[PDB]
Amino acid sequence: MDCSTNISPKQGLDKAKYFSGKWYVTHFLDKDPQVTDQYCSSFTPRESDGTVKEALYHYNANKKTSFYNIGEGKLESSGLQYTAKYKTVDKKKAVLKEADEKNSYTLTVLEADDSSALVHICLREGSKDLGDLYTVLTHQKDAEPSAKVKSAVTQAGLQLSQFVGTKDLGCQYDDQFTSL
Numbered sequence: 423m424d425c426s427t428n429i430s431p432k433q434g435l436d437k438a439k440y441f442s443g444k445w446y447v448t449h450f451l452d453k454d455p456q457v458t459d460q461y462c463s464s465f466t467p468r469e470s471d472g473t474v475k476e477a478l479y480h481y482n483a484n485k486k487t488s489f490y491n492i493g494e495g496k497l498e499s500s501g502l503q504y505t506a507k508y509k510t511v512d513k514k515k516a517v518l519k520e521a522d523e524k525n526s527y528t529l530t531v532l533e534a535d536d537s538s539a540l541v542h543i544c545l546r547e548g549s550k551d552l553g554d555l556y557t558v559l560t561h562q563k564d565a566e567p568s569a570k571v572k573s574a575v576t577q578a579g580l581q582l583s584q585f586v587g588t589k590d591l592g593c594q595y596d597d598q599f600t601s602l
């Protein structure tokens with residue numbers, strides 16, 4: 423199960439609303455049913471003159487482990503979308519593994535406002551895709567996305583009822599790592 427070839431970013435999205443503060447994934451939808459583990463994630467994306475760099479955190483709620491990354495790539499000209507290479511870092515942002523250039527993720531922003539966002543992520547490791555991942559984001563963990571962001575979910579052809587809500591997973595975050 424590959425990522426969809428029909429994802430496009432929303433036009434006219436204010437990149438300012440997206441490359442702001444820290445995001446928490448409040449809801450996620452992974453199209454690949456072969457997965458078991460559920461995750462929490464938070465990240466802090468930043469942009470300058472078309473270059474994006476972001477600090478990323480995952481907590482595996484099933485295995486109770488965590489990992490940290492730094493992603494970097496270039497904004498597409500076309501709309502609010504980038505393919506990043508990523509390194510693996512520790513919680514102090516020291517590099518553990520430099521980027522494997524055969525791996526990337528492409529993040530497409532589908533909606534963004536002052537409180538909330540919807541993005542699609544296609545993670546690729548070499549040959550293999552992880553499959554489509556949609557994440558509803560908010561700045562305040564365990565907050566509800568805005569009506570605008572909820573509408574984007576439906577307009578992406580999805581149903582919010584099918585997303586996993588992270589606020590009930592027993593997530594452990596590292597809010598030190600995502601601040602600034």
Ligand code: HEM
Nearest residue numbers: 447450460461462463465478491508525527543545547557
């Ligand atoms: C709750 C939301 C998320 C879920 C469920 C999820 C799920 C996963 C899973 C299952 C993996 C393991 C990949 C493997 O085993 O090789 C992974 C790794 C990864 N994810 Fe996510 N993810 C989430 C959020 C995000 C976000 C928001 C981003 C990008 C901004 C992202 C980027 C990555 C990257 C770069 C890896 C590391 C791949 C590697 O180690 O080579 N993820 N994620």
